[PDB]
Design an enzyme around this catalytic site. Structure first.
Site, PDB file in Angstrom:
ATOM      1  N   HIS B  89     -51.509  82.453 129.555  1.00 53.75           N
ATOM      2  CA  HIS B  89     -50.453  83.408 129.256  1.00 53.75           C
ATOM      3  C   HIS B  89     -51.075  84.785 129.067  1.00 53.75           C
ATOM      4  O   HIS B  89     -52.299  84.939 129.031  1.00 53.75           O
ATOM      5  CB  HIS B  89     -49.661  82.994 128.010  1.00 53.75           C
ATOM      6  CG  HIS B  89     -50.481  82.955 126.758  1.00 53.75           C
ATOM      7  ND1 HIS B  89     -51.486  82.034 126.555  1.00 53.75           N
ATOM      8  CD2 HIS B  89     -50.443  83.723 125.644  1.00 53.75           C
ATOM      9  CE1 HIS B  89     -52.032  82.236 125.369  1.00 53.75           C
ATOM     10  NE2 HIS B  89     -51.418  83.255 124.796  1.00 53.75           N
ATOM     11  N   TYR B 155     -53.141  90.565 115.496  1.00 52.34           N
ATOM     12  CA  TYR B 155     -52.786  89.340 116.201  1.00 52.34           C
ATOM     13  C   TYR B 155     -53.632  89.148 117.453  1.00 52.34           C
ATOM     14  O   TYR B 155     -54.139  88.049 117.702  1.00 52.34           O
ATOM     15  CB  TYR B 155     -51.300  89.354 116.570  1.00 52.34           C
ATOM     16  CG  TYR B 155     -50.378  89.045 115.410  1.00 52.34           C
ATOM     17  CD1 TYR B 155     -50.112  87.735 115.040  1.00 52.34           C
ATOM     18  CD2 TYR B 155     -49.776  90.066 114.687  1.00 52.34           C
ATOM     19  CE1 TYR B 155     -49.272  87.447 113.981  1.00 52.34           C
ATOM     20  CE2 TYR B 155     -48.933  89.790 113.626  1.00 52.34           C
ATOM     21  CZ  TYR B 155     -48.685  88.478 113.278  1.00 52.34           C
ATOM     22  OH  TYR B 155     -47.847  88.198 112.224  1.00 52.34           O
ATOM     23  N   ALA B 316     -36.684  95.649  23.483  1.00 50.12           N
ATOM     24  CA  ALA B 316     -35.613  94.920  24.144  1.00 50.12           C
ATOM     25  C   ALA B 316     -34.254  95.480  23.743  1.00 50.12           C
ATOM     26  O   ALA B 316     -34.058  95.961  22.623  1.00 50.12           O
ATOM     27  CB  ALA B 316     -35.688  93.433  23.800  1.00 50.12           C
ATOM     28  N   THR B 321     -32.417  96.558  30.941  1.00 50.65           N
ATOM     29  CA  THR B 321     -31.857  95.542  31.823  1.00 50.65           C
ATOM     30  C   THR B 321     -30.460  95.897  32.314  1.00 50.65           C
ATOM     31  O   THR B 321     -30.050  95.411  33.373  1.00 50.65           O
ATOM     32  CB  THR B 321     -31.815  94.189  31.106  1.00 50.65           C
ATOM     33  OG1 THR B 321     -33.128  93.847  30.645  1.00 50.65           O
ATOM     34  CG2 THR B 321     -31.307  93.099  32.040  1.00 50.65           C
TER      35      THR B 321
END
Lengths: 472, 470, 139, 67, 67
Positions: B89, B155, B316, B321
């Site tokens: 080819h 190729y 206290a 608190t």
């Protein structure tokens, strides 16, 4: 190319499975005799006669109807007539070319109706599901099982003469293996000698999520929410998604443990457009040091470019342009650890599995000076841990930020200076005596990133010496 | 400039491929000899002789007919005569100038007919598909392929002796690479060198959003805001597999994102600060409420650092608190430091915005982590029956009556860590006792106090003793 | 105002799709050239030549036949020639005024017959359904 | 957001009946209607749902009702 | 016997490709290729599979092959 495994039960008892069948059909089915090809080692005594003809007619009609309804006469197939433990069946295989998974159900019913109206002539076989297709799961839950070409040599060919009866296929790779046990065994052996990942819709997204996490620098649940809370919540709705979070975290940690270099995560991406606004620039310019040279030295120290001299030591009292930069670097990097100078036995307890070794206001100890010199001089060494096994500590850029002379290595209840020159010949002295103002502000992570990035945009010849050049 | 890939088979056996060929043609094919150029390393023995003449004549006539049918005599081309595994080819390449992609079959057929009538003299080769064009797709459903110049070195040139026989081209860059393996390899080496959508996840996301909006702290508030939702989400088969997860996620989201100052800042301004209970408690004790308010503003906004801690010292029941009881109830999450537990004292303070210390007592087992926590510094500590966790700088408040500087260590006490703790807190002297009709502090009072603080900011001096009221 | 989505698959290979085509047609399709209009910035090299002429002729004859059979030359339209990976396809759009969904099929068949008897000169393209109309469901 | 399903509605009706009849333990369930107790104690998954509904009703009554 | 399935053939191929490179633990997997590691770790049944594969490869390397 996938295939569909169709199961077609061949009626064995024509009286019970086909009650009322005409005598002409039975006569024609019994009068048709078969003979194996010349090059066929299969025993004909074990193979039947009328069931063989029935299966041949069934598969021929099936292939004809498939080629007619799919418009694909060049489609590949693979039929194999076997003998079950209690009923005959066939492992028919047809390609998916021109027939999607959402149309196979209708074609199957149409082919069954055509076969019942032609072959059986209206009489429908009374066998439990004489016509069906293999599903991925038993019942009406699993879908059509789209097998692969490897399914033929994995279930069909392994079967031998006892379970095998006949087979029909147009594939050139399975021509001689139609009625030959030797060819089937050879193909099975070749397939076994020939024989990795798995593609799934649930794993493909996970493979990208684990990669995006490491890209964003996430190593915990808080970092995921820092980016997007909705995104993190979406990946933890069910238990399967929750365990996935832990799995991804563990995998990301174990991967980050094996990147390549620390700067890979510290170095920024985009360049810097205004370095004067950075706090590191001002800290370096206030103490009397060229910001460019300092940035180059930092880049060379973080990239392991110096090797033996790959260490930096910031001198002067605490918090003098030394602690802020180190804290910012520790907050930027994924993991960090403070060298516990108080615990002379295991001072590196907090620096386990960390990327950077930070020494904040701590003096040098003689109990780990020899082992530390290896990591400081670019060498690997497995040091012990606090009530834990040893672990290798690869060459990692160490940063010292103390006020007292590090040369005065303490050895318990005394002090020595034998390790003065050895430790000075592998460290950089940064006389940062200038104290920062109260309104100086802490350095952020983006600032460290911009500093490390600018260190690359302006590279200068870094000389391997002890005293770093100052800003003239 | 693209090129067309036209495959042309070279009839090898003239007796089988060209049945009935005259003897004169075979004589010419066998007589015409060939020889490689002087600078050619390819072996002539491996290259056949008879097929080479046919290939040369074919490519010459093809180029001659193409230059006429396309009107481009100066067009570039590249022919390569190879040898297939069972048939010869040629990879003929011609530029796309003059000839288009749609009007290619006509010219191809004309050139084939001309080549036949000329070389073969009417006899058509019997080779299956001896003259065709490479399509873009294998089958009868693809246009003509239009390659590029890069298709040659990727190729054709890689191919070697067992494949190649000859090649012809006019390109000045591919002349030496037609019959030379060295140049071919050189050119070959030079040229080469999230989110997830689900109906089960959208509901969970909407639930998380609703919880973050309403602000559900614990599971008790869930039933308070809505009972039907908690009943439905608990009726599932998994029962309590997602409730705890969503609670923890919402808590972490609200902690890392927002903080206590986001809600402590009052909405409307203060109309009368003298009526507030905190103001009265701070004034009766003889302490300028303005400095205390500024200190509180700077402490929540973690703006002091080392000194980012308050220590309301005094007997206290002296208004110590009463303020913390409201500060903890106003913020979303709250906890209490268990001074009795020397191992895990921060058992309740897990991801909290405000850490309240009631009757605290420094111990030697947590003297290091305490100096970093109270001093506004990140530090990791081991949790009770849980993994370690980093307590980021969080506002901590003490309301003890004993000496917080005293470090207890079993059956003894040491005052070594006295100055470090003294230089990181704000000591007070609240000795006045509150009457029974004073009442407890509400939630709006803390917001009003914070608003008044933000409205009246003063210089906060790093002093051990807070400025008293003149 | 709605529009009917018409699709026309131009023959990608006249020699394979239009066997026996006259030489005059191929000569006119090959020798005919084109250029970029003034207000155009598209590369002429990437744009084909013969497909452009084929699509122009096709859309022109289609529009003329539609305006003749609908008796509405002032109607709107929108033609767009595309270049698919496997084959060339055209996208034609015509207004739905004066043409109901029932007689639409008859008009389409009539114009298809006229085109295959005039344009192709009695040659049916080998492409599956070279001319049809887009439906609301693939099938 | 609220999930809709048969099991969800069943559990809602169950907890509603519980908080209406003033049930707070397994003894009251048998004292009032011992049939529903054995009916819901059959399935294994229902045993945990029983305790969940008991706790939910207790918490709801403690939050809404008073002493 | 040698049962086969879609889930066992992949495991067999994976262990065969791993034993060729001399994999010791999960640390070597990330060094060779973390992509394949995360690919299998994405599933739920891989946690119990990798632990068994490591021990199987270790026992095999020590009994069949020599240094």
């Amino acid at each position: 190319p996938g295939f569909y495994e169709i199961v077609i039960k061949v009626p064995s008892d024509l009286d019970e499975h086909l009650p009322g069948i005409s005598d002409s059909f039975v006569n024609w089915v019994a009068e048709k005799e078969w003979e194996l090809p010349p090059d066929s080692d299969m025993d004909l005594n074990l193979i039947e006669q009328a069931p063989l003809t029935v299966a041949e007619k069934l598969q021929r009609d099936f292939l004809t109807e498939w080629r007619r309804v799919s418009k694909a006469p060049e489609a590949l197939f693979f039929v194999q007539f076997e003998k079950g433990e209690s009923y005959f069946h066939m492992h028919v295989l047809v390609e998916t070319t021109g027939v999607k998974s959402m149309v196979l159900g209708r074609f199957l019913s149409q082919i069954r109706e055509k076969l019942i109206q032609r072959i059986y002539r209206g009489i429908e076989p009374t066998l439990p599901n004489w016509f069906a297709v293999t599903k991925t799961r038993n019942g009406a839950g699993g879908g059509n099982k789209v097998v692969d070409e490897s399914y033929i040599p994995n279930y069909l060919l392994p079967k031998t003469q006892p379970e095998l009866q006949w087979a029909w296929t147009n594939m050139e790779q399975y021509l001689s293996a139609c009625l030959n046990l030797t060819e089937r065994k050879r193909l099975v052996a070749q397939h076994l000698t020939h024989v990795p990942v798995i593609r799934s819709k649930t794993s493909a997204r996970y493979m990208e999520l684990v990669g995006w996490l490491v890209d964003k620098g996430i190593t915990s649940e808080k970092q995921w929410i820092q980016e997007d809370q909705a995104s993190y919540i979406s990946f933890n709705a069910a238990s399967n998604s929750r365990s996935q979070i832990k799995a991804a975290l563990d995998n990301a940690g174990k991967i980050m443990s094996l990147t390549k270099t620390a700067p890979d995560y510290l170095v920024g991406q985009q360049p810097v457009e205004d370095i004067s606004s950075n706090r590191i620039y001002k800290i370096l310019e206030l103490n009397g040091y060229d910001p460019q040279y300092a940035a180059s030295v930092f880049l060379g120290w973080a990239t392991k470019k110096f090797g033996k001299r790959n260490t930096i030591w910031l001198f002067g009292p605490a918090t003098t342009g030394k602690t802020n930069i180190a804290e910012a670097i520790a907050h930027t990097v994924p993991f960090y650890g403070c060298v516990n100078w108080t615990n002379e036995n295991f001072p590196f307890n907090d620096c386990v599995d960390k990327m950077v070794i930070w020494w904040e206001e701590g003096k040098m100890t003689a109990k780990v000076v020899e082992s530390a010199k290896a990591i400081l001089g670019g060498s690997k060494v497995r040091v012990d841990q606090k009530c834990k096994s040893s672990a290798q500590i690869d060459p990692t850029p160490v940063i010292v930020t103390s006020n007292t002379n590090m040369c005065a290595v303490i050895d318990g209840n005394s002090t020595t200076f034998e390790h003065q020159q050895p430790l000075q010949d592998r460290m950089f002295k940064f006389e940062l005596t200038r104290r920062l103002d109260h309104d100086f502000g802490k350095v952020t992570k983006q600032e460290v990133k911009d500093f490390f990035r600018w260190a690359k945009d302006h590279v200068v010849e870094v000389e391997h010496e002890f005293y770093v050049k100052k800003g003239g």
